[PDB]
């Protein structure tokens, strides 16, 4: 499921990001915990700003978010999605 981003396929990570974006949770706590997990998986310096306070012109749509993460990891010497 979730130890590091390399345990995620790109589809499954898109699932996680879609859930966060829609706040499709049962409590604020569960949402907070998912967003925390996301940050931990991506390791991106912006943390939860990738989802909530995107840069000017950045696609903050779910697919948009996964691309941004995907391109940053690649460009930063980190492992990518499973497979």
């Amino acid at each position: 499921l979730k130890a590091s981003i390399s345990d995620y396929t790109e589809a499954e990570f898109l699932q996680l990001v879609t859930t966060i974006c829609n706040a499709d949770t049962s409590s604020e706590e569960e949402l907070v915990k998912l967003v925390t997990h996301f940050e931990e998986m991506t390791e991106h310096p912006s943390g939860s700003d990738l989802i909530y306070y995107p840069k000017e012109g950045d696609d903050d749509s779910p697919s948009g978010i996964v691309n941004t993460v995907q391109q940053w990891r690649a460009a930063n010497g980190k492992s990518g999605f499973k497979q």
């Binding site: 974006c21 829609n22 706040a23 604020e28 949402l31 907070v32 967003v35 909530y52 995107p54």
Partner: protein, 131 residues
Amino acid sequence: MESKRNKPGKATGKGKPVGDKWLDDAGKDSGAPIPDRIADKLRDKEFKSFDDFRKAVWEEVSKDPELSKNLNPSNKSSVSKGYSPFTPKNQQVGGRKVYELHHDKPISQGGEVYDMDNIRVTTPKRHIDIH
């Protein structure tokens, strides 16, 4: 008694005009006021606990164009459930990543729980620095 916050009460108070930078002020000074527009909607309603009041405030901001315009879509989805919206990373502290409702005169010192003139919106970084 256990907590004064869990005792039912009616929201009172006027709040204050706010503009496009409202949540930006939550990160400064004593925080941002509850907007006069939210107060007009919640004033006189009875809440069973302060948590309840807090969920009402965030559902109201979700339906308010001025207040909601710019909250990005993912924050709009959160406040539409009545959750507190996320702050920018730099104002988050630890597991505290959303906007917090602070009582300007502490409840433990006699400040009113649901008096919206005693209530401020703050980021976790400012709530702890305002302490």
